[PDB]
Amino acid sequence: CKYDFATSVLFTEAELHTRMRGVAQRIADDYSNCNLKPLENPLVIVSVLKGSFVFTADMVRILGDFGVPTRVEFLRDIRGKHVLVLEDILDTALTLREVVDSLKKSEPASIKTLVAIDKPGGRKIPFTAEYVVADVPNVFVVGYGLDYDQSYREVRDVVILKPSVYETWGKELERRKAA
Amino acid sequence: HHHMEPACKYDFATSVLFTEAELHTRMRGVAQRIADDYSNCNLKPLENPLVIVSVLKGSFVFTADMVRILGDFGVPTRVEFLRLCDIRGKHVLVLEDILDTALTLREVVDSLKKSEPASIKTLVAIDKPGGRKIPFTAEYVVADVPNVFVVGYGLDYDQSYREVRDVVILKPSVYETWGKELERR
Ligand SMILES: Nc1nc(=O)c2ncn(CC(COCP(=O)(O)O)COCP(=O)(O)O)c2[nH]1
Ligand SMILES: Nc1nc(=O)c2ncn(CC(COCP(=O)(O)O)COCP(=O)(O)O)c2[nH]1
Ligand SMILES: [Mg+2]
Ligand SMILES: [Mg+2]
């Protein structure tokens, strides 16, 4: 494996970007009759969870390439506006269920969701994102904005950490606790 | 002789000042200096990362690109947004998309110093050195621009254009027209 701290790379940055371009084409098609324009009527991107800044930064630029202008708001007026909620990972769906339900109360013209990583096996309630870049199984991943204990968000790929990473850090946490 | 001037890429811009490629080239140069400068600190994921404090809403683009480049150069980070975890005894690098009057960074740095970080430095994507209202020098600057209003690379005009990949001069046409519309509202 490329990374000394990982056992597996699941998706490279290049694979993610290729899938993101395919999703951007669909979004450009789906919103083509919405008359989106900078200033007068951008697509409102609502980015949810701290780590989603990486995905949001790459995705709004790719959407711009495909002719979909955006404004961004972070959750870490939309009445009559088109809203696309972005999140780095969708797992239990408890976050997005709450965010979507709250945004609906402001009566946007439409609301859809776009997630970089779906763990469809992780649900605690039923929830389907309109747009999914990639799926993973029920494993804990880091990278592409996703962290372990606030570290590793900067890893360019989505990866599975080595067990020794959690073990060393637990032990150091114990150590610092006693001292 | 007759000079030929090609038209600008973007219908809303007068001039592209820095392309995404130029920005990333300069960010790699800066990342090498940062790696050299923090090589004496024994930084590590989890036990001792560099705390990146990202300031202002539009700085998410710069921050996303910069933490990944720093990772390539072996500088592990953790990111915090001001648009705060304990920083006492930690190295802090404050990131900001643009530095102009310096009033934001002066306040942010002074506040953070109260928590006694191990060190504090600043890294900015665009410095407008002629815009100062107080003296201020960033430790690390990706690019300088003259006193003109730019958008792109996370910088907005009234919340639009952050997604433009290049840093560009916004056409006066755009904000004169839109400004009167906002007045009308
Ligand atoms: N780093 C990381 N990797 C995972 O595989 C993973 N699976 C769940 N989570 C925690 C969180 C994701 O935390 C993401 P962040 O650090 O705040 O970007 C799941 O929240 C989505 P949901 O369960 O409400 O739908 C994960 N965090
Ligand atoms: N979009 C944009 N372009 C500029 O040229 C420019 N020059 C100043 N500003 C406004 C703000 C930058 O606003 C950045 P953002 O939309 O919140 O990412 C200057 O703040 C830095 P300082 O004056 O405290 O040092 C600008 N905003
Ligand atoms: Mg997390
Ligand atoms: Mg602004």
Residue numbers in the entry:
A (entry chain B): 5 to 80, 103 to 205
B (entry chain A): -2 to 80, 101 to 202
Q: Which text from the study accompanies this structure?
A:
For example, T. brucei has three 6-oxopurine PRTase isoforms whereas there is only one 6-oxopurine PRTase in humans. These enzymes catalyze the transfer of the ribose 5'-phosphate moiety from 5-phospho-α-D-ribosyl-1-pyrophosphate (PRib-PP) to their respective purine bases (hypoxanthine, guanine or xanthine). Here, we show that two of the three T. brucei isoforms of the 6-oxopurine PRTases are identified as HGPRTs as a reflection of their substrate preference for hypoxanthine and guanine and the third isoform is identified as HGXPRT reflecting that it uses all three naturally occurring bases.
In the HGPRT-I.6 complex the PPi binding site is occupied by the phosphonate connected to the attachment. In this complex the side chain of L53 points inwards towards the active site and the peptide bond between L53-K54 is in the trans conformation. This allows L53 to form hydrophobic interactions with three carbon atoms from the linker and attachments. However, in other crystal structures of HGPRT-I (e.g. in complex with GMP and IMP) the peptide bond between L53 and K54 can exist in the cis conformation, resulting in the side-chain of L53 being rotated out of the active site, allowing space for PRib-PP to bind. Compounds 3 and 6 are the most broadly effective inhibitors tested so far with Ki values lower than 1 μM for all three enzymes.
